[PDB]
């Protein structure tokens, strides 16, 4: 023998959707963080008045 082979190889990235399209769902989850609180804001002060 007298054999030394030490080797390397390269990676295959699984198609993780591979587009920005993920953002739109992320935009919906923005808005549900965003547009919800003022309901309570005006709710508690509607209840004050």
């Amino acid at each position: 023998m007298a054999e030394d082979a030490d080797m390397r190889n390269e990676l295959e990235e699984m198609q993780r959707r591979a587009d920005q399209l993920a953002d739109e769902s992320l935009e919906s989850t923005r808005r549900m963080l965003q547009l919800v609180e003022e309901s309570k804001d005006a709710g508690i002060r509607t209840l004050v008045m």
């Binding site: 080797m7 190889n9 390269e10 295959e12």
Partner: protein, 85 residues
């Protein structure tokens, strides 16, 4: 059947290892001959178009893919003779 539409695919050396057996253990898609091979002759023969190639060192590629019918043509340019130059 207007066949003016052609491409230069250059440096075939890199895209293809003859069957992919070269360089031992390699990625499964480190070489796909099979799609473009299958593309021209595999699903059906295409008579509308012409593919071109450049290789400075052909002998790597030649046995597997230059089998006749995949390409039966093979050509070599030698350097100029005295009047050529």
């Amino acid at each position: 059947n207007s066949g003016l539409h052609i491409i230069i695919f250059d440096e075939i050396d890199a895209i293809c290892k003859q069957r992919g057996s070269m360089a031992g253990s390699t990625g499964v898609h480190d070489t796909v001959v099979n799609q473009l091979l299958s593309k021209i002759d595999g699903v059906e023969q295409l008579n509308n178009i012409l593919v071109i190639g450049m290789t400075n060192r052909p002998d790597l590629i030649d046995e597997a893919l230059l089998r006749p019918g995949r390409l039966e043509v093979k050509m070599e340019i030698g350097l100029p003779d005295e009047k050529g130059r």
